[PDB]
Design an enzyme around this catalytic site. Structure first.
Site, PDB file in Angstrom:
ATOM      1  N   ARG A 193      40.998  43.101  38.515  1.00  0.00           N
ATOM      2  CA  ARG A 193      40.411  44.431  38.669  1.00  0.00           C
ATOM      3  C   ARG A 193      41.262  45.338  39.534  1.00  0.00           C
ATOM      4  NH1 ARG A 193      35.126  44.035  36.216  1.00  0.00           N
ATOM      5  NH2 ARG A 193      34.347  41.906  36.608  1.00  0.00           N
TER       6      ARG A 193
ATOM      7  N   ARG B 202      38.979  49.186  36.749  1.00  0.00           N
ATOM      8  CA  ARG B 202      39.060  48.693  35.394  1.00  0.00           C
ATOM      9  C   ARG B 202      39.807  47.383  35.510  1.00  0.00           C
ATOM     10  NH1 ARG B 202      44.361  48.039  34.290  1.00  0.00           N
ATOM     11  NH2 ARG B 202      45.784  49.770  34.912  1.00  0.00           N
TER      12      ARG B 202
ATOM     13  N   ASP C 280      34.079  43.339  47.544  1.00  0.00           N
ATOM     14  CA  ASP C 280      33.570  42.010  47.788  1.00  0.00           C
ATOM     15  C   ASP C 280      32.665  42.050  48.986  1.00  0.00           C
ATOM     16  OD1 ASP C 280      34.950  40.422  45.889  1.00  0.00           O
ATOM     17  OD2 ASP C 280      36.739  41.263  46.941  1.00  0.00           O
TER      18      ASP C 280
END
Ligand SMILES: Nc1nc2ncc(COP(=O)(O)OP(=O)(O)O)nc2c(=O)[nH]1
Length: 158
Positions: A92, A82, A97
């Site tokens: 976040r 979240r 990534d």
């Protein structure tokens, strides 16, 4: 294609999230986890912020196009993490990534592959180096070399 995905979680107790993320990654269609680095406790890239992160690297075999993989990592970010309201560094709680996507270079509005800053981030490079010590970046840079030269603090395992 082997994609290397960095996982970052800045939760105080990130293991469950990271596991959920790993599960999620393993569930991405056309993909499967090849290897997961150890989980490392890393000092936040921003100020101290406070929160250590858990960082890990995942080697994900995938036949997905990179933007399709990105859809899934972003989905998983949305589903499993979240937003930290107002947080400028690491908004976040969970970052996935794509560090590397095969040997592809991707420079699109959605996606920069190799990850645009990973060469500055011990927390990305060291876990990746754990699982891909011989990794050569698309441009011929070597992960080992980057580490060798920048002398990034080793990471402690979580
Ligand atoms: N130790 C550590 N620090 C961190 N700081 C910021 C982000 C992500 O920051 P963010 O604001 O989302 O920007 P970006 O992902 O574009 O670098 N991730 C980490 C991390 O994974 N480990």
């Amino acid at each position: 294609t082997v994609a290397y995905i960095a996982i970052g979680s800045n939760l105080a107790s990130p293991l469950e999230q990271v596991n959920a993320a790993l599960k999620a990654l393993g569930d991405i269609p056309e993909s499967h986890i090849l290897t997961v680095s150890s989980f490392y406790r890393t000092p936040p890239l921003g100020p101290q912020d406070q929160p250590d992160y858990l960082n890990a690297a995942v080697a994900l075999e995938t036949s997905l196009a990179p933007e399709e993989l990105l859809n899934h990592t972003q989905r998983i970010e949305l589903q499993q993490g979240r937003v930290r309201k107002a947080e400028r560094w690491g908004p976040r709680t969970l970052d996935l990534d794509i560090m590397l996507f095969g040997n592809e270079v991707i420079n699109t509005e959605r996606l920069t592959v190799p990850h645009y800053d990973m060469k500055n981030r011990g927390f990305m490079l060291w876990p990746l180096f754990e699982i891909a010590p011989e990794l050569v970046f698309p441009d011929g840079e070597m992960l080992r070399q980057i580490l060798h030269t920048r002398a990034f603090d080793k990471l402690n395992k979580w």
